[PDB]
């Protein structure tokens, strides 16, 4: 079910530390939103266990390896060995994983947060053996404060007009908080919300009851589909996406007519995949 997913792996005992890899050395390190902390899970169904392969661009063949019999964990060349297979055991209710060696299932990964590396331990109730395995896109975008620029004009961005005017348009980047969005992933609903930083609970929303108009409204109401969006990566890119609405996934976020003029409208429109429906989600400089 998780086969071929590219994920980040972070520590329950410290959710700011992620499995990090360089030149064969595995460590625990802050969030990088890049390949150094991205891993592909490769399922072997006979063993009912996973290889955990680094997405390193320079060496493409490294997998998480237990240097049995030592306490040490590293990455080595994939030789399909027992010490490079792992059981992914999800602790239900707790929403975390225990990661046990296929070579010796009595031993599981242990996060030594003080040494910033991985060790092994027999099973126990500590958080230091618990891990958060997350689709890498969700990992990078969740709680990320960003600016949203159309592919057609990068020096401009999607903005709320001001703290009282809740409409949303295109305007040149000026570092204003009305031009920045904090992305929250809703696990219950498998979709994202965009919180404008000029407000406390103002989310990008598709005002269905008025055609294609999108504004920001309060996130207070318990159930909605217009308030939520799906973010999908355009392949061959590292920061471009399309943004489709949860209510109706055929409706994508659209820059009115492809016009890159200040004040141009932003509204949901039928998905065509053209350049006026592609958005760079970026770190604010």
């Amino acid at each position: 079910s998780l086969n071929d997913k590219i994920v980040t792996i972070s520590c329950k005992a410290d959710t700011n530390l992620f499995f990090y890899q360089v030149a064969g050395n595995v460590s625990l390190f802050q969030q990088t939103r890049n390949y150094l902390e991205r891993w592909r899970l490769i399922y072997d169904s006979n063993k009912a266990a996973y290889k955990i392969k680094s997405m390193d661009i320079h060496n493409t063949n490294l997998v998480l390896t237990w240097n049995a019999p030592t306490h040490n964990i590293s990455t080595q060349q994939d030789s399909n060995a027992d010490n490079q297979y792992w059981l992914l055991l999800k602790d239900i209710g707790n929403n975390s994983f225990i990661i046990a060696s296929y070579k010796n299932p009595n031993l599981v990964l242990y996060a030594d947060t003080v040494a910033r590396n991985l060790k092994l331990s027999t099973l126990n109730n500590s958080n230091y053996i618990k891990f958060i395995i997350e689709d890498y896109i969700i990992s990078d975008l969740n709680n990320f404060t960003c600016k949203i620029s159309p592919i057609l004009d990068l020096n401009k961005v999607v903005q709320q007009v001001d703290v009282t005017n809740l409409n949303v348009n295109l305007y040149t980047w000026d570092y204003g908080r009305n031009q920045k969005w904090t992305i929250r992933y809703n696990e219950e609903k498998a979709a994202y919300q965009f919180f404008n930083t000029i407000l406390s609970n103002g989310v990008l929303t598709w005002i269905f009851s008025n055609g294609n108009t999108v504004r920001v409204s309060s996130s207070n109401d318990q159930n909605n589909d217009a308030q939520y969006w799906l973010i999908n990566p355009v392949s061959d890119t590292d920061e471009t996406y399309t943004i489709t609405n949860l209510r109706d996934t055929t409706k994508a976020l659209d820059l009115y007519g492809g016009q890159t003029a200040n004040g141009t409208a932003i509204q949901v429109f039928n998905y065509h995949g053209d350049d006026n429906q592609k958005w760079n989600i970026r770190n604010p400089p």
């Binding site: 049995a68 019999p69 306490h71 070579k103 009595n106 331990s121 027999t122």
Partner: protein, 144 residues
């Protein structure tokens, strides 16, 4: 002079899964490796009468004793109450080795995991014991 069922002195230690593999330290773990004829595969067994247990030190590192850590592994460490072992002799040279102290209010014992009788590269662990029938908890002590 002999106080017990297991004389003081130097021993090789083996899993019943193999007559050709020998207990020695590799980094901070303990494991069973090919015959080296060296002192790191020689273990000095010594009876402590006060508490009726045995201390087992490595002859290449005479002030280090078989002990256990907080991660489930057997270890080579300084003397402490974790270095006390309570053997159960179940055959001529075959023993189960319990920690003297209850751990997690159970008997715990040396334990070596096998894969179809293969133990290569496995660390010696400390795991619950319930009876004298667990193959992975049976070890041979050979005078040498």
């Amino acid at each position: 002079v002999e106080r017990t069922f297991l004389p003081n002195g130097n021993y090789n230690i083996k899993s019943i899964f193999s007559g050709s593999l020998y207990l020695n330290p590799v980094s901070k773990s303990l494991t069973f490796s090919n015959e080296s004829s060296a002192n790191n595969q020689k273990w000095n067994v010594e009876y402590m009468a006060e508490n009726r247990c045995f201390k087992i030190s490595n002859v290449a590192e005479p002030n280090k004793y078989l002990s256990y850590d907080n991660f489930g592994f057997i270890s080579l460490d300084s003397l402490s109450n974790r270095c006390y072992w309570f053997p159960i002799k179940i055959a001529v040279n075959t023993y189960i080795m319990l920690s003297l102290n209850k751990v997690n209010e159970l008997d715990y014992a040396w334990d070596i995991y096998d894969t179809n009788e293969n133990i290569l590269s496995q660390p010696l662990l400390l795991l619950p014991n319930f009876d004298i029938y667990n193959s992975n908890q049976m070890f041979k002590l050979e005078k040498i």
